[PDB]
Amino acid sequence: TASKQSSRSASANNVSSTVVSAPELSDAGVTASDKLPRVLPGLNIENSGNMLFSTISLRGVSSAQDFYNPAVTLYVDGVPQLSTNTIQALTDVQSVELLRGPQGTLYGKSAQGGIINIVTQQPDSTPRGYIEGGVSSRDSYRSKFNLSGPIQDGLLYGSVTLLRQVDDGDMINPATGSDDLGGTRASIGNVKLRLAPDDQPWEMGFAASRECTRATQDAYVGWNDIKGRKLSISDGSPDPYMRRCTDSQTLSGKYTTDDWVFNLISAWQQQHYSRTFPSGSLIVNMPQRWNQDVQELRAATLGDARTVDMVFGLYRQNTREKLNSAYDMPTMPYLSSTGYTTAETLAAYSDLTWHLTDRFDIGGGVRFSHDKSSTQYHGSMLGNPFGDQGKSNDDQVLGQLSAGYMLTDDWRVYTRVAQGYKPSGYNIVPTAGLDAKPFVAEKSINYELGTRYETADVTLQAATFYTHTKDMQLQTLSNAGKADATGVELEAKWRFAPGWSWDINGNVIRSEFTNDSELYHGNRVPFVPRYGAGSSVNGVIDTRYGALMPRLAVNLVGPHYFDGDNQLRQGTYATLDSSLGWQATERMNISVYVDNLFDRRYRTYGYMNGSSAVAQVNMGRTVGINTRIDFF
């Protein structure tokens, strides 16, 4: 379904995936990307410094030192997002689908842990709309209006969503005495046009959007002062402040035949954010501009029964980025810079499945890919002019292989050999002194053995796996690293009564650098909890006053480190979330929710500034009230 091909294919079934629907996202309070862990087992997302840089990790594959190229990439309707826009608000999602294991063949670069794929909802002939509106701790609120439906029935349909989410923090800046820092405040707009003539084989889409988030958060607290609120900012320093604006435009296209379906895509995305924050005696100021565009074109064979399922594709993605840095002492400059740097890619790919028996299929795909790249920077450190330029190119060939025997009618066993990668290319930030030689591609490769058992009332899914990453990109950005992640996952779901379900999940992973690694040899790979497990019951009691729907959810995250040197460890924590919905009237549902009930604190991220360990910390417990009237 986000395998880009048939429901029956190798890639759809010989893979550990999880899909979460729009109502489930609300029930768990997933109002933004970075809360998907609540519903996607094995996924860990945290800010590394702030919003713009995630430390997304999955199956013990991670970022690790380089935050402009993640191991999991977020695609929205198949369109890759900018790395700096991965943590975004969810505005009108129908579902989110997660594919675990490398996905280099079907999706491409930065697809080593997996991919997350948001499927936005298309307006159709049925009129549909709603209001959703909350208020929470720390003077946080949230407000969403959505309206969709026919503009000229049988021809043109449309939708509009407006969102204002503010999820505020309560941190303090000694220097100024502001006491509302640490949070984010986004305003977002989003329109869709769909042109689906009533008796024709083709559609066309158009989407526009505009997000503007402000965040105050490039600030840390003492590494052993987690419950505290006073940020480590020396007097004189101002508050930190960033503000990003992303504009996106997608242009879709579809065409159905008896035997084949051809999609065309062409997206655009332009970001520019200001970012400035104090760090120690310095004030850092690092605004940036992005400008990517992707066009994809692909044929695929619907539907079954067929002995050969196929997909073919032609992808092309061009990104341009520009950075200005300015690190500054009170009395004089320390460093300044300015760097354009770009990456383009053409890629053909194909993925085949062969159903030999009724119960046995063998599948495999290959992706050819020609990457280009090109930095150009100049700067001045401690008054010493530097700067270089450089073009480059390279081409890779990733591939998959899978096999699945159906033990019974609804219990299959599969096997996989997949292959992810981050491309060769140039360091995004200028470095003084070292001349610009492009680093070579990181190269992951996973072997997976797993099973799935699907009844009407029960889904069970478990897998075992080993990934080997090499030439890992890890001042400088060169490739000097090797890692081995191996572990086991279990996800299971059971509708014991009607209206009720019970989720459970757990994973145990060991991900370490190899003994022959040029760096951190032997150490645990950062941001990868040793083990993690969670569970959550939710159902529908029924009453004279209207249906009540209570949810209870627990999550346990094992010990992990933030650095290669393994000097900065978090160590285990768990959190209990809960909520109670109430269908007061037939169209209006009010609910109250406290999540992290026991105000447990823990560290989101850390790094060592000189000799002092500093850490960012979780906000704590939030209680809130959230109501949704829906239209028509």
Swiss-Prot record:
Keyword annotations: Cell outer membrane, Ion transport, Iron, Iron transport, Membrane, Receptor, Signal, TonB box, Transmembrane, Transmembrane beta strand, Transport
PROSITE patterns, A to Z: TONB_DEPENDENT_REC_3
Ranges where the TBDR beta-barrel domain occurs: 126-631
Listed SUPFAM superfamilies: Porins
GO CC terms in record: cell outer membrane
Domain of life assignment: Bacteria
Motif (TonB C-terminal box) on chain: 616-632
Name of the protein described by the UniProt record: Pesticin receptor
